[PDB]
Short mmCIF file of C-alpha atoms in Angstrom, two decimals:
data_model
loop_
_atom_site.label_atom_id
_atom_site.label_comp_id
_atom_site.label_asym_id
_atom_site.label_seq_id
_atom_site.Cartn_x
_atom_site.Cartn_y
_atom_site.Cartn_z
CA UNK A 1 149.69 118.56 96.16
CA UNK A 2 148.89 114.77 96.31
CA UNK A 3 147.14 113.86 99.67
CA UNK A 4 147.64 110.02 100.89
CA UNK A 5 144.58 109.29 99.93
CA UNK A 6 144.72 110.14 96.43
CA UNK A 7 147.99 108.94 96.52
CA UNK A 8 146.48 105.52 97.48
CA UNK A 9 144.34 105.69 94.72
CA UNK A 10 146.62 106.59 91.72
CA UNK A 11 149.01 103.85 92.89
CA UNK A 12 146.18 101.23 93.77
CA UNK A 13 142.82 102.04 92.52
CA UNK A 14 141.66 100.39 88.83
CA UNK A 15 137.77 100.85 89.60
CA UNK B 1 158.05 99.62 79.36
CA UNK B 2 156.04 97.24 76.76
CA UNK B 3 152.80 95.89 76.38
CA UNK B 4 151.43 93.98 79.37
CA UNK B 5 148.93 95.74 82.04
CA UNK B 6 151.76 95.71 84.57
CA UNK B 7 154.44 97.49 82.27
CA UNK B 8 151.55 100.06 81.06
CA UNK B 9 149.61 100.59 83.88
CA UNK B 10 153.06 101.36 86.14
CA UNK B 11 153.68 104.15 83.39
CA UNK B 12 150.58 105.81 82.96
CA UNK B 13 149.77 106.04 86.55
CA UNK B 14 153.56 107.75 87.41
CA UNK B 15 155.02 105.23 89.19
CA UNK B 16 157.65 104.08 86.85
CA UNK B 17 158.05 107.35 84.80
CA UNK B 18 161.29 108.32 86.97
CA UNK B 19 162.57 104.60 88.59
CA UNK B 20 161.45 100.90 88.56
CA UNK B 21 159.22 100.18 91.41
CA UNK B 22 159.92 96.42 92.42
CA UNK B 23 156.48 95.56 93.03
CA UNK B 24 152.81 97.15 93.33
CA UNK B 25 149.07 95.89 93.67
CA UNK B 26 146.19 97.13 91.50
CA UNK B 27 142.60 96.31 92.76
CA UNK B 28 140.03 95.94 90.26
CA UNK B 29 136.84 96.95 92.43
CA UNK B 30 134.93 100.29 92.75
CA UNK B 31 136.67 103.19 94.76
CA UNK B 32 134.01 102.60 97.18
CA UNK B 33 134.37 99.30 97.73
CA UNK B 34 137.67 99.64 98.28
CA UNK B 35 136.99 102.70 100.93
CA UNK B 36 134.12 100.47 103.14
CA UNK B 37 136.80 98.34 103.87
CA UNK B 38 137.90 100.90 106.40
CA UNK B 39 135.43 100.07 108.57
CA UNK B 40 135.49 96.29 108.02
CA UNK B 41 137.76 93.44 110.07
CA UNK B 42 140.22 95.59 112.46
CA UNK B 43 143.45 93.90 112.45
CA UNK B 44 147.10 94.60 113.41
CA UNK B 45 148.86 95.94 110.68
CA UNK B 46 152.84 94.34 109.88
CA UNK B 47 154.30 97.28 112.05
CA UNK B 48 151.79 96.36 115.09
CA UNK B 49 150.06 99.40 114.84
CA UNK B 50 146.33 98.50 114.61
CA UNK B 51 144.62 100.79 111.86
CA UNK B 52 144.61 98.30 109.68
CA UNK B 53 141.37 96.30 108.20
CA UNK B 54 140.80 92.95 106.27
CA UNK B 55 138.04 92.83 103.43
CA UNK B 56 135.66 90.51 104.45
CA UNK B 57 135.42 89.12 101.02
CA UNK B 58 138.20 88.68 98.09
CA UNK B 59 138.48 91.39 95.52
CA UNK B 60 140.02 91.39 92.30
CA UNK B 61 143.70 92.11 91.99
CA UNK B 62 146.72 92.28 90.13
CA UNK B 63 150.37 92.38 91.34
CA UNK B 64 152.79 93.74 89.13
CA UNK B 65 156.31 92.71 90.30
CA UNK B 66 159.83 93.30 88.40
CA UNK B 67 161.55 90.80 86.83
CA UNK B 68 165.43 89.90 87.68
CA UNK B 69 166.11 91.46 83.99
CA UNK B 70 164.51 94.82 84.97
CA UNK B 71 166.93 98.05 84.83
CA UNK B 72 165.59 101.29 84.65
CA UNK B 73 164.86 103.07 81.96
CA UNK B 74 163.23 99.71 80.85
CA UNK B 75 161.43 98.17 83.76
CA UNK B 76 159.84 94.80 82.98
CA UNK B 77 157.17 93.40 85.14
CA UNK B 78 155.43 90.06 85.89
CA UNK B 79 151.82 90.61 85.96
CA UNK B 80 149.46 87.76 88.22
CA UNK B 81 146.00 88.23 88.91
CA UNK B 82 144.32 86.81 91.23
CA UNK B 83 141.25 87.18 94.40
CA UNK B 84 142.88 87.97 97.24
CA UNK B 85 141.46 89.79 100.55
CA UNK B 86 143.08 93.15 100.83
CA UNK B 87 144.23 94.78 104.68
CA UNK B 88 144.74 98.47 104.44
CA UNK B 89 145.54 101.08 106.45
CA UNK B 90 143.35 103.53 107.30
CA UNK B 91 143.69 107.40 108.67
CA UNK B 92 141.71 110.45 108.29
CA UNK B 93 138.36 111.85 108.19
CA UNK B 94 136.94 110.17 106.00
CA UNK B 95 138.89 107.60 107.23
CA UNK B 96 140.08 106.18 103.88
CA UNK B 97 142.53 104.08 103.10
CA UNK B 98 145.95 105.52 102.84
CA UNK B 99 148.45 102.35 102.59
CA UNK B 100 148.16 98.90 101.56
CA UNK B 101 149.26 96.40 103.91
CA UNK B 102 148.96 93.02 102.31
CA UNK B 103 147.06 90.72 100.40
CA UNK B 104 145.47 87.28 101.78
#
């Protein structure tokens, strides 16, 4: 399942 | 849900597939440079806790904010691009960003 760090990246990273 | 970056990305990243989320920020920097902020300027978070860090430089960001006319299922977003310092709360090992606290 999704860690809090993975969730920050899916919601906020657009590298 | 139409063609403009916020409506597209909010949908693709699973933020508006089952609700309309009011606001969300996207950072257009490499992931490791965003993760590098966790060892930059330590600041208090809005909630008083002190595991927040502020970037030394501004970063390219897009703010997505729901219009007054937005209703699920048809979320609609105003798109505002800016360059701002980001403040993130960090946890874990590796100490990585887990929450966006603001842009400045």
